[PDB]
Amino acid sequence: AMGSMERASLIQKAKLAEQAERYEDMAAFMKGAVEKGEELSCEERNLLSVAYKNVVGGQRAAWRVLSSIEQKSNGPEVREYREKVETELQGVCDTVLGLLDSHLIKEAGDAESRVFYLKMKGDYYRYLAEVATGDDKKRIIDSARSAYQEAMDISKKEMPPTNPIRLGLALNFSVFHYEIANSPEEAISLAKTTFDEAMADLHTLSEDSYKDSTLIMQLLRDNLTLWT
Amino acid sequence: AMGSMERASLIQKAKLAEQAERYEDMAAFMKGAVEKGEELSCEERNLLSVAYKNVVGGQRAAWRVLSSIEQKSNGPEVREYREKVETELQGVCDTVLGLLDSHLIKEAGDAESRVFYLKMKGDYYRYLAEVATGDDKKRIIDSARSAYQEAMDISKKEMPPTNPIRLGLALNFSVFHYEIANSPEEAISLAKTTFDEAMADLHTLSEDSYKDSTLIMQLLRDNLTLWT
Ligand SMILES: COc1cccc(NC(=O)COc2ccccc2P(=O)(O)O)c1
Ligand SMILES: COc1cccc(NC(=O)COc2ccccc2P(=O)(O)O)c1
Ligand SMILES: [Cl-]
Ligand SMILES: [Cl-]
Ligand SMILES: [Cl-]
Ligand SMILES: [Cl-]
Ligand SMILES: [Mg+2]
Ligand SMILES: [Mg+2]
Ligand SMILES: [Mg+2]
Ligand SMILES: [Mg+2]
Ligand SMILES: [Mg+2]
Ligand SMILES: [Mg+2]
Ligand SMILES: [Mg+2]
Ligand SMILES: [Mg+2]
């Protein structure tokens, strides 16, 4: 439905929607921008990610509330409404994954863009895994793992240990190991090694880069504190 | 779209949606419940009001952000996106006003229900007035005034000065005078008289009623502090 709007106007409106805290609109504008077919700049990739993380975030928070109520109840209403929210969440994840597959990842040749999009792919499969059951569920978990792993492999070859996309990827992959893969030791090892190798590279940074990197290192530290 | 769901299940889901902070869903469930044609109980009237106040609240907050950006800008994008949000806000207000006219107010014979719905009518015309321009605009302002006035007339005849619906009505009508009607003296007089007559009636209240009433009296006091 954004086919008739200029790419530049979609980006401008996404920024307005962010100011207005209208994240559903923000996501729809950025989906429209991606669907123009051109690669996205760093700033535009960040608008895409912020929009969808806020949308899916509201859904995941609601799903958690409902799932809790349902499990303590264990008529059809709680299950029905949890399933409604679950389906809408699945739809948003499928939308994002669709944008990544058609055709953001395939056209992403620079490490910053390719790692960004593979991290996003890992994150949205991870959100699908949170609500998935059984077997179907193993293939979803492995899709998340596979995307994160490819991103990690590129990030380790092509980016310094303090790069904020590399740090955020490692942070989220550690969360995947702790929360999804039942691998708390792998989570803790990854968060530890990532933190230590970033610390050793801080000396190479300007003041502003240092602020960017240490912000994410503090999130790694927060998890490690929660996990140990 | 809620025609096939049981009234009781719509109410139950509205309560779940409130826990989940899913206010759009909450409003749609309560719209469905109203459309069953039966009068609403006190608790159900409160669910209706909470749902729509949160929905329109998000819209009014966004509209304010956008209007500010637009007026400081004064391409078409800011105006266009402010108009989009404005139209959606107008639609929600029209929806609420429609439920009140078809047929909540006409079937409301008790003072608690009739005052509640006439206050709501004043509030949603007030939200339309916030975004309205010119003349069209005078009739909207007078519709809000007229609804609030009828509610006030009934409330003064039928409810004690500490009743929380009477207090909330007076609070909102004072806000209408200050923000919409350019009548700050009327706003201040109304808030003052309402506060003083409630204070004089507190002695008649139980501990829990006292807590309910004094909460709203503090909002009147907060406005008076802001306005004087
Ligand atoms: C963004 O809104 C929500 C809703 C529900 C859960 C969360 N996530 C959290 O509270 C913590 O999640 C993380 C912590 C470190 C890295 C990544 C995440 P995640 O949100 O699971 O991508 C966020
Ligand atoms: C509920 O979300 C919003 C969004 C934008 C504005 C507001 N309202 C306010 O900040 C203060 O408004 C009032 C104060 C006292 C009584 C009534 C109101 P109102 O929200 O204008 O019905 C609320
Ligand atoms: Cl449902
Ligand atoms: Cl490529
Ligand atoms: Cl628009
Ligand atoms: Cl009647
Ligand atoms: Mg063009
Ligand atoms: Mg399901
Ligand atoms: Mg390329
Ligand atoms: Mg490099
Ligand atoms: Mg029935
Ligand atoms: Mg308009
Ligand atoms: Mg009746
Ligand atoms: Mg009475």
Curated annotation (Swiss-Prot), chains A, B:
The protein's organism comes out as Homo sapiens (Human)
Q: Which Pfam families match?
A: 14-3-3
Which Gene Ontology CC terms are recorded?
cytoplasm; cytosol; extracellular exosome; extracellular space; nucleus
GO term, biological process aspect, one: negative regulation of innate immune response
Assembly and partners are described as: Homodimer. Interacts with KRT17 and SAMSN1. Found in a complex with XPO7, EIF4A1, ARHGAP1, VPS26A, VPS29 and VPS35. Interacts with GAB2. Interacts with SRPK2. Interacts with COPS6. Interacts with COP1; this interaction leads to proteasomal degradation. Interacts with the 'Thr-369' phosphorylated form of DAPK2. Interacts with PI4KB. Interacts with SLITRK1. Interacts with LRRK2; this interaction is dependent on LRRK2 phosphorylation.
Positions of post-translational Phosphoserine modification: 9
Q: Name one GO molecular function term.
A: identical protein binding
Name assigned to this protein: 14-3-3 protein sigma
Tell me the compartments it is located in.
Cytoplasm; Nucleus; Secreted
**Which purpose does this protein serve, as stated in its record?**
Adapter protein implicated in the regulation of a large spectrum of both general and specialized signaling pathways. Binds to a large number of partners, usually by recognition of a phosphoserine or phosphothreonine motif. Binding generally results in the modulation of the activity of the binding partner. Promotes cytosolic retention of GBP1 GTPase by binding to phosphorylated GBP1, thereby inhibiting the innate immune response. Also acts as a TP53/p53-regulated inhibitor of G2/M progression.
Family, as annotated: Belongs to the 14-3-3 family.
Q: Kindly list the residues the record flags as site (Interaction with phosphoserine on interacting protein).
A: 60, 126
Signal peptide annotation: none
Predominantly, its location class is cytoplasm
User: Where does the entry say this protein is expressed, by tissue?
Assistant: Present mainly in tissues enriched in stratified squamous keratinizing epithelium.
Give a short account of its post-translational modification: Ubiquitinated. Ubiquitination by RFFL induces proteasomal degradation and indirectly regulates p53/TP53 activation.
Keywords, ordered alphabetically: Cytoplasm, Nucleus, Phosphoprotein, Secreted, Ubl conjugation
Cite the InterPro entries for this sequence. 14-3-3, 14-3-3_CS, 14-3-3_dom_sf, 14-3-3_domain, 14-3-3_sigma
